[PDB]
């Protein structure tokens, strides 16, 4: 039932792959739709206007020409309501950029290697999650500049962590990576709630060696994207399917899952083609009514999540679509590519 028209496109002049794109879902109703792109040592902001206009706002160029941004995530200052943008990549440095001025406010060193994804907690705008090439996830409090917790170690991931997602209420995180596993880390445990409270009073970081659930029985290759769909999980590898699944047996409550739970239940698969290369994200809109994924030859797939597929193509769009982003009202869908191109699709 969802139809789109390609109204505009452009190419960034660095000609390098764009790995991340995010609309600012914190902008208030009646304010312009803004999105950020990341790739090379660049972070660029654009504003969407009528008749498909993509207005370049400003660009951040890292002083380090060898930096390669892989991810970005929006938040806001909990005291001034000012928008904020976190970016990170190959250098493993988290930069908090003021998006109004495109200047870096501060940066965090910590991860032993590249940062593959950043996510902000859905209730607390100060809680930033980073997933890294060093096999760990890190939770930061960007108000007090503290490392709350490191999720890794004895039973942590055994290879690069590629993706992670908080659930809708921010009680838990599901991570995934190169070791083919998906691991659950509850952050509403008395231990984690207290560590978060202590980060505000500041530092001794929590070292969480053991996840609340783990499986290697969904995919048989690198797991490069994970998102919660209510109590269910959507995850993909390079096997031309997004798998919808849940820990435990069919009737098992996600909050009653024990850490040693050996079962998983597959609920369905979203099948597609030509997306068998590593490092390709899927995305959902705010209301989780639409699911989008680009493929390695520039096709954009869109599914209606309220029923269980629309294919968006343009003859000039033939490069791998690394990530997509819906505007908060789902009226606009942006796709970014391996050839530095950006595509704007408007919902009909």
């Amino acid at each position: 039932k969802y139809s789109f028209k390609c109204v505009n496109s452009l190419k960034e002049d660095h000609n390098q792959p764009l790995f991340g794109v995010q609309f600012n879902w914190h902008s208030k109703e009646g304010d312009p739709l803004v999105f950020a792109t990341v790739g090379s040592n660049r972070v660029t902001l654009y504003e969407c206007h009528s008749q498909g206009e993509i207005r370049l706002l400003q660009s951040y160029v890292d002083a380090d020409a060898d930096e390669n941004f892989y991810t970005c995530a929006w938040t806001y200052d909990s005291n001034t309501s000012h928008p904020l943008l976190a970016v990170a990549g190959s250098r493993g440095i988290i930069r908090i950029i003021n998006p109004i001025t495109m200047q870096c406010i501060k940066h965090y060193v910590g991860h032993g290697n590249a940062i593959n994804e950043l996510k902000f907690h859905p209730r607390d705008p100060n809680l930033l999650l980073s997933v890294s090439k060093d096999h760990a996830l890190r939770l930061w409090n960007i108000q007090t500049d503290t490392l709350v917790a490191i999720f890794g170690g004895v039973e942590g991931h055994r290879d690069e962590v590629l993706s992670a997602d908080y659930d809708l209420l921010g009680e838990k995180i599901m991570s995934c990576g190169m070791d083919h596993s998906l691991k659950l880390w509850r952050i509403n445990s008395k231990r984690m709630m207290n560590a978060i409270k202590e980060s505000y009073d500041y530092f001794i970081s929590q070292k969480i060696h053991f996840p609340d659930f783990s499986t290697r029985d969904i995919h048989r290759n690198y797991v490069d994207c994970v998102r919660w769909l209510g109590d269910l999980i959507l995850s993909k590898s390079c096997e031309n399917a997004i798998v919808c699944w849940k820990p435990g047996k069919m009737e098992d409550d996600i909050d009653k899952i024990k850490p040693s739970e050996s079962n998983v239940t597959i609920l369905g698969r979203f099948d597609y083609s030509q997306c068998d290369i590593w490092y390709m994200r899927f995305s959902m809109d705010f209301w989780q009514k639409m699911l989008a994924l680009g493929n390695q030859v520039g096709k954009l797939y869109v599914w209606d999540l309220e029923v269980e597929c629309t294919t968006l193509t343009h003859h000039k769009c033939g490069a791998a679509i690394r990530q997509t982003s819906f505007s908060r009202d789902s009226s606009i869908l942006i796709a970014v590519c391996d050839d530095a191109s950006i595509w704007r699709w408007d919902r009909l």
């Binding site: 914190h26 902008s27 001034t80 000012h82 928008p83 109004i100 809708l168 705010f286 309220e306």
Partner: peptide
């Protein structure tokens, strides 16, 4: 589905929290 009801109620809580906020435009 029951899962869709959880998505509706939980996204509604986040939407109400967003409606209470007035973040400065970029």
């Amino acid at each position: 589905s029951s899962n869709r009801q959880k998505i509706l109620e939980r996204t509604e809580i986040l939407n109400q929290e967003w409606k209470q906020r007035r973040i400065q435009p970029v």
